[PDB]
Design a protein around this nucleic acid. Sequence first.
DNA 1: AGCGCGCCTAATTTCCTAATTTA
DNA 2: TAAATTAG
RNA 3: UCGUCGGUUCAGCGACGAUAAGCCGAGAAGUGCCAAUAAAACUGUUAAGUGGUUUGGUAACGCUCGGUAAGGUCCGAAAGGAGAACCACUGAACGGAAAUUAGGCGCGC
Lengths: 422, 387
Amino acid sequence: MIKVYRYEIVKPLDLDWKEFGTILRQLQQETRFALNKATQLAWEWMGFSSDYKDNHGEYPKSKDILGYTNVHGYAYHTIKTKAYRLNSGNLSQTIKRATDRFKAYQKEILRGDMSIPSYKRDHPLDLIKENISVNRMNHGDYIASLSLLSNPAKQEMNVKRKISVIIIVRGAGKTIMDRILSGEYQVSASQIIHKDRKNKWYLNISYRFEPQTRVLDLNKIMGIDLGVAVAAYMAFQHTPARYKLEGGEIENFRRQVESRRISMLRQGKYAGGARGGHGRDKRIKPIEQLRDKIANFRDTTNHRYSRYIVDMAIKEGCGTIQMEDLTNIRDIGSRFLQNWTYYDLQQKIIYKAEEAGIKVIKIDPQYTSQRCSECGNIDSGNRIGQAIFKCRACGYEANADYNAARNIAIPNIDKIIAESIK
Amino acid sequence: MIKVYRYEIVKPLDLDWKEFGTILRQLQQETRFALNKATQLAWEWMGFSSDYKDNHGEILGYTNVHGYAYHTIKTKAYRLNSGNLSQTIKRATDRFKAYQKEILRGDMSIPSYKRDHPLDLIKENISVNRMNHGDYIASLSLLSNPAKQEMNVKRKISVIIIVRGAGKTIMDRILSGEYQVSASQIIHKDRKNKWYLNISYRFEPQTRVLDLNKIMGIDLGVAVAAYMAFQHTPARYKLEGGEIENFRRQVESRRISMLKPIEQLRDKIANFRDTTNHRYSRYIVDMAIKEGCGTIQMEDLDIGSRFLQNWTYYDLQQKIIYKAEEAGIKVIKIDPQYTSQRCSECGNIDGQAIFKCRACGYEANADYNAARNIAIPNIDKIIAESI
DNA sequence: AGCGCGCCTAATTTCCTAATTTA
DNA sequence: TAAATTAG
RNA sequence: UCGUCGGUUCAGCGACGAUAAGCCGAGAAGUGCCAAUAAAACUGUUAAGUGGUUUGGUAACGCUCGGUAAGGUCCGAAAGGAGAACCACUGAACGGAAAUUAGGCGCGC
Ligand SMILES: [Mg+2]
Ligand SMILES: [Mg+2]
Ligand SMILES: [Mg+2]
Ligand SMILES: [Zn+2]
């Protein structure tokens, strides 16, 4: 398992912030240059090999023609002369991401199902495991030594050693960094991230650890039902316990955002003079800030929602979690009327349940809210979302979200519906 | 000048849909090959090629990138029409030339072209005719002479397109001669499995001339800062004071927080009213210029229950009056008595969020209802007629 | 007050190298 | 002696 | 009402800023515009027709980069001050980056 944590950079230990910013921006420009050029060299080789096969009947050998086993070696040999400021290790890692992206989707590129990747302006600076190192001083401060320059670059920038920075290691970041220093966690390739808001640089340390999973009974299954009145309702087949996420705070957020977003757009029709004449970024600045705010709110809401769901499973001893596969369903009449980011929520559940030893299975949500959880009679007549579920034969009434949650908690439930469609 | 508008293809007139679909897919495959190969040929022509291209294994006799690419691609994409093939190659080379300096610097990788790429149709290959029975037929020339012989198509391929409302207006002028076809494309959408043919037409725009018969009406309504309406046209424009409500709450917080500071706040609030008036006046005049209305009618000049509370109303009117003169428009002041209550549709004179006539039953925003009443050239006279 | 924009939002996949050798 | 290079 | 500082996100708190949904600078990669010039391609016996290319310049642009207010101690009459140097809370979370795709909108009227 691999996880990432962010650490804010405060000060360069031996340089000024103005000088540090100039170095970082220059290295970012080379990273963009390396990524685009590598895809150009990869795309060029793909065309040459296709042409070579037609004229000779066999694909050419990279070693014979290109001089290297893979295009990654050839890309390094060419981009190095121009991207001479980055460290060779970081440059090689940067090039590899471009070439692997092209190699992975090469078949889709030829078939026209995907475009050639093009890389934007602000790009993270790659760091290799051996290039990053972190130490704790006696006086309780954390110093990170970064290798970000090549020998020509170090000579021209007067730097003669690692460029040290101070990172705020606090809260849950202290435990992760303490385990990295001890040796339980192993640092993998990282990157340096810059955020436009607050103008802060970050150190994106990614680390490798071994999950500690307790033996949980695999016959216990918890069902997650994205309900109508309730954001998510959880139920278990063995025990009559129920949990729910009312999602009251979600409704309040969208009301303020919808009113704000509509108002901003209308003013754009008669905005100020300086609103235009300075590019696209300035003109759409008010909406970009609003769009970023919504993205951050969903990320936090999905983070706390996934944790609550997994924690409920752990308390009840469940070893299996079943949810609805949303690939087929496209009529979102659920509580998340603002088209919530369901995929981010489901991915967060998976990787947090995997860390706890629980296995996640995606059932097909068809007639799951219509079926009765007592007698199993499936009727489409009562599909009205009446906030209640009154079976005409079982005589069992319960919350519609709760009734759907029980059905998802039954093993092989979709097949049961599949065997007897109605 | 040039604008685009889709026209859904109903069915092929001469051949079956199964045959037409197979034919078009063959042409679509040649379109990608022409596009992708033209990018490779332009890459070598501009000197972007690496060493191993011209050293290991593998001037040119032509003058332009398009000329070099055309002949090389023509041998394989022999089903496409010669005229359309040139257009496909041209759009490939034009993008590369526009992006030539970006790729050399390293800001863009390589132009790419998707699978279901639209087919290019030049002028002289797409004609439209309207039959005596009202069916619109568009004849498309898509196959070259070798392709026509093999596929047993002995003339131009004809298809029927839908023309409803705005589509018929443009198409009728195309047939008349006011609008001339420039280029076209056959786009395919997988959402509905339908083929679309969009026509790019060139026309000489007509500049609206100010006439003293369209009179814009402005009402300082309760729900918005102003509402603009007209009788000749059904269009409407609104000035919502969203920024004004935020600024009022800003001023309220600052006064409590500050409890010179009052003087600076008063100076700030004075400038805000001036800046908003300038933006509002310019927008008000622009919508009259856009529709060519030669007169603006606004109620003659308290705070009342209007959305703007204790605003600099007189300053707003003067800047509207002044900016109207520069455009040739003239401003007339009208008595506002019972303007909100009078019904525009029926004229009878009688909840404030949406006005509903007792007799007519017309339901609409009261701000819009008042705005239409002011638009009448002789609204002032009929106001006292009911009295 | 319809039926074409361009494009935004959400969904989706991949990745998070090492071993050797100049300096 | 940490930066450079290339193979699988 | 929005925003800044208190390790990140979302909430409050203490202070503060706001015409900030505001005001500006430089530059020429791209789209329009102005001068000069008229290639590729196609229909063509021809005659000739469609088509709009190339080099400069300008700076209107949802052109491209950037600047601009905001915690407390401290100096400074105050403004202002060289990311000067110290100090700064409560709750719930804490796996991130890049690329791509395809649909439904909010404008469009
Ligand atoms: Mg649902
Ligand atoms: Mg906060
Ligand atoms: Mg905290
Ligand atoms: Zn039942």
